[PDB]
């Protein structure tokens, strides 16, 4: 052994489950809402199903300039009106 | 007789916390419609 309490002990303790029957669902719900609120989309810049193309466009908004790449992506985004 | 907040505790939670959050997210994703 190396001093820490056995996991067998911890995960079968009543206290562990009093704590984690709160903390685990809380997290799960936090992640759930992170998606369902739409926040994920905006944090990582990921297209929603209606934001990949404008209505009649069919050209991928591929980044083509290294240093003004950012302004390129911003332009691609504005192009969705 | 036993400590609660060890190095092991830390490691375990740095992995476990984000995992449960992520699985909540992915769960949510299963009901996204185009």
């Amino acid at each position: 052994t190396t001093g820490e309490r056995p996991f067998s002990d911890i995960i079968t303790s009543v206290r562990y489950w009093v704590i984690h029957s709160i903390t685990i669902p809380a997290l799960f719900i936090a992640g759930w809402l992170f998606v369902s609120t739409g926040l994920a989309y905006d944090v990582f810049g990921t297209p929603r199903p209606d934001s990949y193309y404008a209505q009649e466009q069919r050209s991928i908004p591929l980044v083509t300039d290294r240093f003004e790449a950012k302004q390129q992506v911003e332009t691609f985004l504005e192009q969705l009106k | 007789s036993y400590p609660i907040f060890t190095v092991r505790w830390v490691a375990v939670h740095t992995l476990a916390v984000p995992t449960i959050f992520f699985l909540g997210a992915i769960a949510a994703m299963q009901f996204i419609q185009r």
């Binding site: 903390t23 997290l27 936090a30 609120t37 | 907040f5």
Partner: peptide, 30 residues
């Protein structure tokens, strides 16, 4: 942004809860 509070309210309530429950043993340890 309201969605950050809505989403990370579960997390901070979990942490607050467990802090409340583990506080005496944590103080005893520290």
């Amino acid at each position: 942004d309201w969605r950050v509070l809505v989403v990370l309210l579960p997390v901070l309530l979990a942490a607050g809860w467990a802090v409340r429950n583990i506080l005496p043993y944590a103080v005893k340890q520290v």
